[PDB]
Ligand binder design. Structure first.
Ligand SMILES: Nc1ncnc2[nH]cnc12
Ligand SMILES: Nc1ncnc2[nH]cnc12
Lengths: 237, 237
């Protein structure tokens, strides 16, 4: 039972479009009237969950669903900001986590690494088997879309070209891209030992000037591409 | 059924000490082997939950417990860093949230307020009735401990006298104190419409030089004081 987690309705819509046997399920024990969609993708049981934005929304709703259903795999789909320079990163390209970490967590004063939560790795590793399946997709050129595999960084900010961007880069040199939920989901996954992977697509490049405009232009389409890659990964699960 | 939430075992220990009919309950559907304690405080049903540190731990575990039990009230107990100057803030004093907000959430670029999560208030308001009960405790001088009521700020850093401290202050002038979980818990509470309040005690003052030493010295004792105030509030619930 595969949990596909997205932050924004635009991002989840590209997953919800491709569900077979789609049903609306309502969570309401606290009158929250929260709708999730359950269905199938290529014969595999899927829940599409929309969390809202940021670490606490992602953690809160992932946790709810994990409590109420037997989740075997977590896929975090949606948009990402591509940050790594001179490495062929383009808007609409696919970004896949080999690892993820917070850039905005800091108990350095107590000797933990930058981004590291106590008793957890600094870098949550995506599932070995999910990564081999990504390799397969890359090697067989199923998508006419460049795929980058690497470190995705998470924090509760929409990253722009202010000097916020440069200190992240200096803290994690090899970092590929950013998001507002990836390592929150990875932390939840770690706690419940559920294999995870982050599968996003580049909506914008933070270094560039009005990246929020590109972000608005490409959100839906980057969601299309994330969903296509998610579909192909599910084929192999 | 009152959920008392603490981040550190030292903080939860001061709550667990005062539970009557204390039982260990094990959550293990994912082999996480997570222990929570259930009991009574002055005849009122209580779950003491220890989350681990930071926003995602707090959100993840609060969410789990809320899924599995009928929670009527949330109290966030533990230690806090007192930041507001020239207002009689002392180590071991009690800090009570009238409101709480993140200092480290920023979608300003999209026009939201500093700290504000989309579709949520910038400032989560503690429960009106819990606040009146705090007033009662203050007015009747039940504790020989100064109580401050105000804005508590949350983010995923241990706050020190680096210039991190000053930009928080400039973003929220009236701010009283900081913590790493308060507004994460307030966000969860908001989602499930559960009345919350943050009841902490000052372990340290960030402006001062080696505040991490004071934090280590006073963690247990500030936890004692938070627990005493929590007890008195529960008396009135
Ligand atoms: N620039 C950015 N910052 C944070 N999250 C994003 N998701 C897509 N683009 C982003
Ligand atoms: N200085 C500080 N920063 C964050 N959380 C705290 N809890 C107690 N003291 C603190």
């Amino acid at each position: 039972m595969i949990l596909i987690i997205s932050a924004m309705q635009e991002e989840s819509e590209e997953i919800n479009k491709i569900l077979d046997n789609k049903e609306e399920i309502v969570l309401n024990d606290y009158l929250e009237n929260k709708k999730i969609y359950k269905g199938k993708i290529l014969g595999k049981d899927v829940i599409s969950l929309t969390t809202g934005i940021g670490k606490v929304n992602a953690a809160t709703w992932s946790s709810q669903i994990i409590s109420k259903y037997k989740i075997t795999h977590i896929i975090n789909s949606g948009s990402s900001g591509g940050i790594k320079e001179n490495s062929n990163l383009k808007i609409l390209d696919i970004i896949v986590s080999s690892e993820t970490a917070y850039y905005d967590f800091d108990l350095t004063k107590f000797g933990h690494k930058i981004g590291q939560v106590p008793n957890l790795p600094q870098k949550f590793k995506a599932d070995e088997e999910l990564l081999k399946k990504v390799a397969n997709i890359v090697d067989n050129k199923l998508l006419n879309i460049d795929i980058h595999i690497g470190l995705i960084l998470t924090g509760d900010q929409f990253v722009d070209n202010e000097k916020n961007l440069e200190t992240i880069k200096k803290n994690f040199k090899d970092a590929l891209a950013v998001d507002m939920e990836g390592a929150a989901i990875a932390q939840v996954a770690h706690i419940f030992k559920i294999p995870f992977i982050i599968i996003r697509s580049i909506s914008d490049l933070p270094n560039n000037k009005d990246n929020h405009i590109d972000f608005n232009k490409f959100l839906k389409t980057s969601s299309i591409n994330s969903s296509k890659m998610t579909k192909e990964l599910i084929r192999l699960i």
